[PDB]
Amino acid sequence: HGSPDVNVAMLITPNPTIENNGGGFIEMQLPPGDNIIYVGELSHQWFQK
Amino acid sequence: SRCTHLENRDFVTGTQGTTRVTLVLELGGCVTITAEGKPSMDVWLDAIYQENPAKTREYCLHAKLSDTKVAARCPTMGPATLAEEHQGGTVCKRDQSDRGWGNHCGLFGKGSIVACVKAACEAKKKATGHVYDANKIVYTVKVEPHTGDYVAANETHSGRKTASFTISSEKTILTMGEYGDVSLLCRVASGVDLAQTVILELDKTVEHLPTAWQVHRDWFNDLALPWKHEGAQNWNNAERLVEFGAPHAVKMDVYNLGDQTGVLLKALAGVPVAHIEGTKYHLKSGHVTCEVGLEKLKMKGLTYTMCDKTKFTWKRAPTDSGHDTVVMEVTFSGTKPCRIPVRAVAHGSPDVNVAMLITPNPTIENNGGGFIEMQLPPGDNIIYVGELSHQWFQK
Amino acid sequence: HGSPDVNVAMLITPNPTIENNGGGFIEMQLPPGDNIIYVGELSHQWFQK
């Protein structure tokens, strides 16, 4: 929250993709505090910890 | 936004992770809640009242006296008596008058005399007290989403919702139109203690007076006026408004102390007013703490394209809100719906956006949008709504 | 009031029942303070003391 330029997401799921019959589940780690998760233009507030 | 209508306004802000917010709402106040990724909300305690509270005593402010009767006996004839001396609803005084041949007695001496009057109360001259039951008192809370539409105080915002709370029903879930659901947990037990409160009512139909007062129970119970229970036929201590003159021969005058309303009103100056609306007895001052759940709220218009930067004009130029924020309203002549490209820069630094928006994701809908409230740093700034600009000196 | 999970009613009337031609009167003891009495979904506020 406040620094829209720095990506702070550490992905556990490798190269997330939407296959013809799968994909979509993502697991990631975020730093403590208020963050906003973006999947393209889709967004979600997230307070970590 | 409703909160912009009053001077008493607070701003509550939830940061990253903040999903719940605890507020202390006060009658006459208003709270603007803002939170990252959530549409902003205006919340306020609107009323505190109880319908048909229990009545304690009724007091009489102006006695209506009638049917004065006097009985007198000569010095050797024994006690004077009247049937009224034993009836309720009469005030009597027994005394002795000087008698002799001049007023037809055989002896010159003291003779028994008794005078009585029927005592009632003038129509609409009562002062009645009412007491609250914490279990029946209702607290009304209103919520209004920030929709980018400005509505004046005499107008009704279509998105405003109302929630009522009693001690036995502390939680409500409200559906804020397309913004999602908001949960409200307000605890009436956290409200005003009413043990020593009495709502005093005179004649609520009098035009140049408040309809009620909030007074202390001990003061009310000590009023030196005739009193009775609602429903009772007669008054206790009616003698408090009646005086008897010294007797002379076979007569004794009865005096009425007049209307005590003026006397009471002097005592009531400086006492807080209350209000009665039909059967509802309202407090005009009070507070309650609520917990607001924001997790189910969603913003509107995030996937619209940006509005054409060339089609904005000012309907209401930027103006000081009185809450250290700037309010304004734009008109858009392009195709709707779309996101409004708003920003502001400090004079001399065109690269840094310094605008902190109160209004969430400003958009021009097919039939709304355009009102924006923001905060700017002190000094000279320039507000931009696309290519539309406006100078603004903050402070 | 505030603890909907704990039953605080101490019944004087044993196994209250509605018979074909009787039942319905109940006498109970409650702890001091604000309580809510429930007879199924029927409820009633009760301040004890």
Side-chain angles (χ1 to χ4, degrees):
Chain A
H1 183 305
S3 313
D5 293 306
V6 188
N7 180 357
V8 299
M10 299 154 259
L11 296 177
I12 296 293
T13 314
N15 187 55
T17 55
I18 296 286
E19 302 292 346
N20 282 122
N21 54 351
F25 165 70
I26 302 166
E27 177 179 24
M28 63 170 69
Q29 184 172 40
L30 290 170
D34 298 285
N35 304 273
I36 297 93
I37 296 165
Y38 290 100
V39 176
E41 295 189 345
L42 177 68
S43 70
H44 206 289
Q45 295 302 304
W46 181 254
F47 175 69
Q48 180 55 53
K49 253 195 187 165
Chain B
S1 191
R2 199 271 170 169
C3 289
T4 65
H5 297 166
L6 25 160
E7 186 194 44
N8 187 14
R9 178 184 186 193
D10 292 315
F11 290 86
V12 166
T13 185
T15 47
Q16 186 63 234
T18 305
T19 190
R20 202 130 147 175
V21 169
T22 301
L23 319 164
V24 172
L25 300 176
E26 61 192 12
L27 226 41
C30 197
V31 185
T32 293
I33 306 176
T34 58
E36 291 165 34
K38 301 294 183 185
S40 296
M41 297 288 244
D42 273 1
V43 187
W44 67 98
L45 173 56
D46 198 64
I48 302 178
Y49 66 90
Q50 183 187 330
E51 288 194 53
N52 311 298
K55 298 187 170 195
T56 46
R57 304 172 177 183
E58 288 183 330
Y59 282 112
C60 179
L61 294 165
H62 193 191
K64 178 179 187 176
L65 307 175
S66 74
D67 296 16
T68 315
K69 293 186 186 185
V70 182
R73 294 286 204 141
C74 286
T76 55
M77 301 298 260
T81 62
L82 284 169
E84 288 75 5
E85 290 189 74
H86 303 304
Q87 298 167 33
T90 61
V91 174
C92 304
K93 198 193 181 175
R94 302 187 57 81
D95 208 339
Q96 285 186 137
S97 56
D98 299 309
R99 303 301 299 276
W101 289 8
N103 40 68
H104 308 88
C105 292
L107 289 177
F108 286 74
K110 296 291 183 176
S112 163
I113 185 166
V114 59
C116 296
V117 265
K118 272 150 60 179
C121 200
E122 281 292 345
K124 295 183 171 190
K125 287 293 165 178
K126 298 188 196 172
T128 304
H130 306 260
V131 293
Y132 286 112
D133 178 335
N135 277 277
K136 292 178 178 178
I137 197 159
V138 179
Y139 280 66
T140 298
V141 176
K142 289 184 190 284
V143 183
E144 181 180 292
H146 283 222
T147 61
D149 298 289
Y150 187 81
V151 173
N154 75 328
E155 294 160 16
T156 50
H157 189 296
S158 57
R160 188 177 300 167
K161 298 290 180 177
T162 302
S164 277
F165 301 92
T166 55
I167 268 186
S168 63
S169 188
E170 64 188 13
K171 194 173 181 188
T172 294
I173 309 284
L174 295 169
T175 291
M176 303 310 301
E178 298 162 288
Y179 297 92
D181 284 358
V182 63
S183 68
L184 278 175
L185 201 175
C186 301
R187 291 186 186 79
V188 167
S190 81
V192 180
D193 177 65
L194 306 157
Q196 297 301 89
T197 288
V198 173
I199 299 307
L200 177 72
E201 176 183 359
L202 298 198
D203 173 7
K204 71 182 179 179
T205 66
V206 168
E207 204 180 313
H208 300 288
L209 279 184
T211 60
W213 290 261
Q214 181 181 170
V215 305
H216 193 283
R217 181 191 150 77
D218 292 329
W219 175 85
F220 176 78
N221 285 145
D222 268 49
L223 292 183
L225 295 172
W227 66 276
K228 73 181 186 60
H229 289 302
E230 166 194 41
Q233 194 189 330
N234 304 318
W235 296 88
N236 300 127
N237 302 121
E239 70 279 345
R240 286 170 184 167
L241 296 184
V242 181
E243 216 66 86
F244 285 96
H248 41 28
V250 303
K251 294 176 181 181
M252 185 159 46
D253 295 318
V254 181
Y255 304 122
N256 186 327
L257 295 188
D259 187 353
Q260 303 299 298
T261 301
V263 174
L264 191 62
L265 290 177
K266 292 193 169 193
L268 296 175
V271 161
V273 301
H275 179 61
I276 302 172
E277 191 58 57
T279 60
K280 294 176 185 168
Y281 285 64
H282 298 254
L283 281 173
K284 295 307 287 178
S285 189
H287 63 275
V288 72
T289 66
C290 300
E291 291 189 62
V292 187
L294 306 171
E295 58 293 309
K296 301 300 168 187
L297 293 175
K298 49 190 176 182
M299 290 190 145
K300 191 181 173 185
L302 287 175
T303 70
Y304 295 167
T305 42
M306 294 302 310
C307 295
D308 183 327
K309 294 175 178 170
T310 284
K311 321 262 201 156
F312 289 98
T313 47
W314 297 108
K315 180 111 72 184
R316 295 200 227 206
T319 192
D320 212 290
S321 73
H323 293 114
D324 295 319
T325 61
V326 190
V327 292
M328 64 209 75
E329 187 188 352
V330 298
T331 299
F332 180 71
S333 57
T335 47
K336 308 160 186 179
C338 55
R339 281 145 64 220
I340 302 178
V342 213
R343 69 188 168 99
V345 302
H347 183 305
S349 313
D351 293 306
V352 188
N353 180 357
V354 299
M356 299 154 259
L357 296 177
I358 296 293
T359 314
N361 187 55
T363 55
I364 296 286
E365 302 292 346
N366 282 122
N367 54 351
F371 165 70
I372 302 166
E373 177 179 24
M374 63 170 69
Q375 184 172 40
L376 290 170
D380 298 285
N381 304 273
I382 297 93
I383 296 165
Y384 290 100
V385 176
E387 295 189 345
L388 177 68
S389 70
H390 206 289
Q391 295 302 304
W392 181 254
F393 175 69
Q394 180 55 53
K395 253 195 187 165
Chain C
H1 183 305
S3 313
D5 293 306
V6 188
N7 180 357
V8 299
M10 299 155 259
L11 296 177
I12 296 293
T13 314
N15 187 55
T17 55
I18 296 286
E19 302 292 346
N20 282 122
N21 54 351
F25 165 70
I26 302 166
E27 177 179 24
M28 63 170 69
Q29 184 172 41
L30 290 170
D34 298 286
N35 304 273
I36 297 93
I37 296 165
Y38 290 100
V39 176
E41 295 189 345
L42 177 68
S43 70
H44 206 289
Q45 295 302 304
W46 181 254
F47 175 69
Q48 180 54 53
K49 253 195 187 165

PDB file of all heavy atoms in Angstrom, chain B residues 357-378:
ATOM      1  N   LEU B 357      -7.459  11.084  -2.373  1.00  0.00           N
ATOM      2  CA  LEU B 357      -8.900  11.024  -2.603  1.00  0.00           C
ATOM      3  C   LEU B 357      -9.708  10.439  -1.453  1.00  0.00           C
ATOM      4  O   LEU B 357      -9.316   9.446  -0.857  1.00  0.00           O
ATOM      5  CB  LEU B 357      -9.199  10.234  -3.883  1.00  0.00           C
ATOM      6  CG  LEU B 357      -8.690  10.808  -5.206  1.00  0.00           C
ATOM      7  CD1 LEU B 357      -9.014   9.857  -6.328  1.00  0.00           C
ATOM      8  CD2 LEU B 357      -9.330  12.163  -5.481  1.00  0.00           C
ATOM      9  N   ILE B 358     -10.812  11.096  -1.122  1.00  0.00           N
ATOM     10  CA  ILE B 358     -11.720  10.613  -0.087  1.00  0.00           C
ATOM     11  C   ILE B 358     -12.739   9.780  -0.883  1.00  0.00           C
ATOM     12  O   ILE B 358     -13.109   8.684  -0.477  1.00  0.00           O
ATOM     13  CB  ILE B 358     -12.480  11.774   0.629  1.00  0.00           C
ATOM     14  CG1 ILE B 358     -11.509  12.688   1.388  1.00  0.00           C
ATOM     15  CG2 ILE B 358     -13.553  11.208   1.551  1.00  0.00           C
ATOM     16  CD1 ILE B 358     -10.859  12.045   2.543  1.00  0.00           C
ATOM     17  N   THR B 359     -13.211  10.335  -2.001  1.00  0.00           N
ATOM     18  CA  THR B 359     -14.154   9.644  -2.880  1.00  0.00           C
ATOM     19  C   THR B 359     -13.387   8.491  -3.555  1.00  0.00           C
ATOM     20  O   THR B 359     -12.377   8.716  -4.234  1.00  0.00           O
ATOM     21  CB  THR B 359     -14.698  10.589  -3.971  1.00  0.00           C
ATOM     22  OG1 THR B 359     -15.075  11.838  -3.377  1.00  0.00           O
ATOM     23  CG2 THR B 359     -15.915   9.976  -4.670  1.00  0.00           C
ATOM     24  N   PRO B 360     -13.859   7.240  -3.369  1.00  0.00           N
ATOM     25  CA  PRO B 360     -13.205   6.061  -3.958  1.00  0.00           C
ATOM     26  C   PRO B 360     -13.472   5.942  -5.461  1.00  0.00           C
ATOM     27  O   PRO B 360     -14.589   6.251  -5.936  1.00  0.00           O
ATOM     28  CB  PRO B 360     -13.880   4.907  -3.209  1.00  0.00           C
ATOM     29  CG  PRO B 360     -15.339   5.399  -3.137  1.00  0.00           C
ATOM     30  CD  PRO B 360     -15.139   6.864  -2.712  1.00  0.00           C
ATOM     31  N   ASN B 361     -12.439   5.518  -6.192  1.00  0.00           N
ATOM     32  CA  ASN B 361     -12.505   5.296  -7.641  1.00  0.00           C
ATOM     33  C   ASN B 361     -13.564   6.155  -8.350  1.00  0.00           C
ATOM     34  O   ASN B 361     -14.563   5.631  -8.872  1.00  0.00           O
ATOM     35  CB  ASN B 361     -12.771   3.808  -7.899  1.00  0.00           C
ATOM     36  CG  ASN B 361     -12.677   3.451  -9.367  1.00  0.00           C
ATOM     37  OD1 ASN B 361     -11.669   3.716 -10.013  1.00  0.00           O
ATOM     38  ND2 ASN B 361     -13.735   2.858  -9.903  1.00  0.00           N
ATOM     39  N   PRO B 362     -13.336   7.481  -8.420  1.00  0.00           N
ATOM     40  CA  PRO B 362     -14.307   8.374  -9.066  1.00  0.00           C
ATOM     41  C   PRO B 362     -14.649   7.916 -10.477  1.00  0.00           C
ATOM     42  O   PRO B 362     -13.758   7.661 -11.295  1.00  0.00           O
ATOM     43  CB  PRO B 362     -13.597   9.744  -9.043  1.00  0.00           C
ATOM     44  CG  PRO B 362     -12.654   9.631  -7.849  1.00  0.00           C
ATOM     45  CD  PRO B 362     -12.132   8.216  -7.993  1.00  0.00           C
ATOM     46  N   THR B 363     -15.940   7.809 -10.756  1.00  0.00           N
ATOM     47  CA  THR B 363     -16.404   7.364 -12.056  1.00  0.00           C
ATOM     48  C   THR B 363     -17.586   8.185 -12.501  1.00  0.00           C
ATOM     49  O   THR B 363     -18.253   8.821 -11.683  1.00  0.00           O
ATOM     50  CB  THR B 363     -16.891   5.883 -12.016  1.00  0.00           C
ATOM     51  OG1 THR B 363     -17.889   5.727 -10.996  1.00  0.00           O
ATOM     52  CG2 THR B 363     -15.728   4.924 -11.741  1.00  0.00           C
ATOM     53  N   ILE B 364     -17.800   8.226 -13.807  1.00  0.00           N
ATOM     54  CA  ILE B 364     -18.949   8.907 -14.358  1.00  0.00           C
ATOM     55  C   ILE B 364     -19.819   7.731 -14.814  1.00  0.00           C
ATOM     56  O   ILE B 364     -19.419   6.961 -15.698  1.00  0.00           O
ATOM     57  CB  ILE B 364     -18.582   9.758 -15.572  1.00  0.00           C
ATOM     58  CG1 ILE B 364     -17.620  10.881 -15.173  1.00  0.00           C
ATOM     59  CG2 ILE B 364     -19.855  10.292 -16.219  1.00  0.00           C
ATOM     60  CD1 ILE B 364     -18.281  11.999 -14.408  1.00  0.00           C
ATOM     61  N   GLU B 365     -20.931   7.511 -14.123  1.00  0.00           N
ATOM     62  CA  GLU B 365     -21.842   6.420 -14.467  1.00  0.00           C
ATOM     63  C   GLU B 365     -22.808   6.944 -15.519  1.00  0.00           C
ATOM     64  O   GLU B 365     -22.716   8.109 -15.934  1.00  0.00           O
ATOM     65  CB  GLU B 365     -22.618   5.947 -13.234  1.00  0.00           C
ATOM     66  CG  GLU B 365     -21.747   5.474 -12.071  1.00  0.00           C
ATOM     67  CD  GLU B 365     -20.986   4.173 -12.345  1.00  0.00           C
ATOM     68  OE1 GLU B 365     -21.310   3.474 -13.332  1.00  0.00           O
ATOM     69  OE2 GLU B 365     -20.071   3.837 -11.552  1.00  0.00           O
ATOM     70  N   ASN B 366     -23.728   6.098 -15.965  1.00  0.00           N
ATOM     71  CA  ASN B 366     -24.683   6.526 -16.980  1.00  0.00           C
ATOM     72  C   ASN B 366     -25.635   7.600 -16.455  1.00  0.00           C
ATOM     73  O   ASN B 366     -26.124   8.436 -17.225  1.00  0.00           O
ATOM     74  CB  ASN B 366     -25.467   5.329 -17.551  1.00  0.00           C
ATOM     75  CG  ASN B 366     -24.656   4.517 -18.569  1.00  0.00           C
ATOM     76  OD1 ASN B 366     -24.444   3.314 -18.394  1.00  0.00           O
ATOM     77  ND2 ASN B 366     -24.206   5.173 -19.635  1.00  0.00           N
ATOM     78  N   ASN B 367     -25.837   7.629 -15.138  1.00  0.00           N
ATOM     79  CA  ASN B 367     -26.749   8.595 -14.519  1.00  0.00           C
ATOM     80  C   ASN B 367     -26.244   9.109 -13.168  1.00  0.00           C
ATOM     81  O   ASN B 367     -27.037   9.382 -12.263  1.00  0.00           O
ATOM     82  CB  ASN B 367     -28.123   7.938 -14.330  1.00  0.00           C
ATOM     83  CG  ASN B 367     -28.039   6.615 -13.551  1.00  0.00           C
ATOM     84  OD1 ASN B 367     -26.939   6.088 -13.286  1.00  0.00           O
ATOM     85  ND2 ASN B 367     -29.198   6.069 -13.188  1.00  0.00           N
ATOM     86  N   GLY B 368     -24.934   9.266 -13.037  1.00  0.00           N
ATOM     87  CA  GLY B 368     -24.385   9.742 -11.785  1.00  0.00           C
ATOM     88  C   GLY B 368     -22.887   9.915 -11.839  1.00  0.00           C
ATOM     89  O   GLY B 368     -22.281   9.724 -12.894  1.00  0.00           O
ATOM     90  N   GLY B 369     -22.290  10.220 -10.691  1.00  0.00           N
ATOM     91  CA  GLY B 369     -20.854  10.424 -10.616  1.00  0.00           C
ATOM     92  C   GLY B 369     -20.492  11.871 -10.903  1.00  0.00           C
ATOM     93  O   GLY B 369     -21.331  12.642 -11.380  1.00  0.00           O
ATOM     94  N   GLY B 370     -19.263  12.260 -10.582  1.00  0.00           N
ATOM     95  CA  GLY B 370     -18.860  13.623 -10.850  1.00  0.00           C
ATOM     96  C   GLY B 370     -18.433  14.422  -9.639  1.00  0.00           C
ATOM     97  O   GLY B 370     -17.662  15.385  -9.778  1.00  0.00           O
ATOM     98  N   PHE B 371     -18.973  14.079  -8.468  1.00  0.00           N
ATOM     99  CA  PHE B 371     -18.616  14.762  -7.228  1.00  0.00           C
ATOM    100  C   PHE B 371     -17.363  14.099  -6.680  1.00  0.00           C
ATOM    101  O   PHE B 371     -17.271  12.872  -6.622  1.00  0.00           O
ATOM    102  CB  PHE B 371     -19.771  14.703  -6.207  1.00  0.00           C
ATOM    103  CG  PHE B 371     -19.359  15.059  -4.807  1.00  0.00           C
ATOM    104  CD1 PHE B 371     -19.017  16.359  -4.473  1.00  0.00           C
ATOM    105  CD2 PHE B 371     -19.297  14.081  -3.821  1.00  0.00           C
ATOM    106  CE1 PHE B 371     -18.616  16.684  -3.177  1.00  0.00           C
ATOM    107  CE2 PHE B 371     -18.897  14.395  -2.516  1.00  0.00           C
ATOM    108  CZ  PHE B 371     -18.555  15.700  -2.196  1.00  0.00           C
ATOM    109  N   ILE B 372     -16.386  14.914  -6.304  1.00  0.00           N
ATOM    110  CA  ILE B 372     -15.121  14.413  -5.779  1.00  0.00           C
ATOM    111  C   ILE B 372     -14.708  15.233  -4.570  1.00  0.00           C
ATOM    112  O   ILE B 372     -14.852  16.455  -4.564  1.00  0.00           O
ATOM    113  CB  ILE B 372     -13.956  14.560  -6.813  1.00  0.00           C
ATOM    114  CG1 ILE B 372     -14.277  13.836  -8.118  1.00  0.00           C
ATOM    115  CG2 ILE B 372     -12.648  14.042  -6.224  1.00  0.00           C
ATOM    116  CD1 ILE B 372     -13.343  14.221  -9.249  1.00  0.00           C
ATOM    117  N   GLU B 373     -14.243  14.539  -3.537  1.00  0.00           N
ATOM    118  CA  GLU B 373     -13.738  15.195  -2.348  1.00  0.00           C
ATOM    119  C   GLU B 373     -12.313  14.668  -2.184  1.00  0.00           C
ATOM    120  O   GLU B 373     -12.081  13.457  -2.249  1.00  0.00           O
ATOM    121  CB  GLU B 373     -14.556  14.859  -1.102  1.00  0.00           C
ATOM    122  CG  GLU B 373     -13.956  15.495   0.168  1.00  0.00           C
ATOM    123  CD  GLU B 373     -14.748  15.223   1.446  1.00  0.00           C
ATOM    124  OE1 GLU B 373     -15.498  14.222   1.534  1.00  0.00           O
ATOM    125  OE2 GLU B 373     -14.595  16.013   2.390  1.00  0.00           O
ATOM    126  N   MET B 374     -11.358  15.564  -1.970  1.00  0.00           N
ATOM    127  CA  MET B 374      -9.972  15.159  -1.813  1.00  0.00           C
ATOM    128  C   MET B 374      -9.268  16.068  -0.821  1.00  0.00           C
ATOM    129  O   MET B 374      -9.799  17.113  -0.430  1.00  0.00           O
ATOM    130  CB  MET B 374      -9.242  15.240  -3.165  1.00  0.00           C
ATOM    131  CG  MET B 374      -9.172  16.672  -3.735  1.00  0.00           C
ATOM    132  SD  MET B 374      -8.070  16.855  -5.168  1.00  0.00           S
ATOM    133  CE  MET B 374      -8.968  15.951  -6.387  1.00  0.00           C
ATOM    134  N   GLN B 375      -8.090  15.635  -0.386  1.00  0.00           N
ATOM    135  CA  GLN B 375      -7.272  16.417   0.522  1.00  0.00           C
ATOM    136  C   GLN B 375      -5.976  16.738  -0.234  1.00  0.00           C
ATOM    137  O   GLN B 375      -5.458  15.902  -0.987  1.00  0.00           O
ATOM    138  CB  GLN B 375      -6.966  15.630   1.787  1.00  0.00           C
ATOM    139  CG  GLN B 375      -6.195  16.425   2.810  1.00  0.00           C
ATOM    140  CD  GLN B 375      -6.063  15.689   4.128  1.00  0.00           C
ATOM    141  OE1 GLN B 375      -5.839  14.476   4.163  1.00  0.00           O
ATOM    142  NE2 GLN B 375      -6.216  16.420   5.223  1.00  0.00           N
ATOM    143  N   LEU B 376      -5.471  17.951  -0.043  1.00  0.00           N
ATOM    144  CA  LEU B 376      -4.267  18.402  -0.716  1.00  0.00           C
ATOM    145  C   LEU B 376      -3.339  18.989   0.318  1.00  0.00           C
ATOM    146  O   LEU B 376      -3.794  19.426   1.373  1.00  0.00           O
ATOM    147  CB  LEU B 376      -4.619  19.497  -1.723  1.00  0.00           C
ATOM    148  CG  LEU B 376      -5.390  19.090  -2.970  1.00  0.00           C
ATOM    149  CD1 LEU B 376      -5.866  20.317  -3.712  1.00  0.00           C
ATOM    150  CD2 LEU B 376      -4.464  18.240  -3.831  1.00  0.00           C
ATOM    151  N   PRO B 377      -2.020  18.972   0.049  1.00  0.00           N
ATOM    152  CA  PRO B 377      -1.052  19.535   0.992  1.00  0.00           C
ATOM    153  C   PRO B 377      -1.132  21.060   0.931  1.00  0.00           C
ATOM    154  O   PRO B 377      -1.620  21.627  -0.055  1.00  0.00           O
ATOM    155  CB  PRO B 377       0.285  18.990   0.474  1.00  0.00           C
ATOM    156  CG  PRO B 377       0.058  18.841  -0.985  1.00  0.00           C
ATOM    157  CD  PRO B 377      -1.333  18.259  -1.045  1.00  0.00           C
ATOM    158  N   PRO B 378      -0.724  21.742   2.017  1.00  0.00           N
ATOM    159  CA  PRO B 378      -0.753  23.208   2.091  1.00  0.00           C
ATOM    160  C   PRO B 378       0.067  23.834   0.969  1.00  0.00           C
ATOM    161  O   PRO B 378       1.072  23.260   0.535  1.00  0.00           O
ATOM    162  CB  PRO B 378      -0.114  23.494   3.451  1.00  0.00           C
ATOM    163  CG  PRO B 378      -0.455  22.269   4.260  1.00  0.00           C
ATOM    164  CD  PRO B 378      -0.191  21.165   3.266  1.00  0.00           C
TER     165      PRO B 378
END
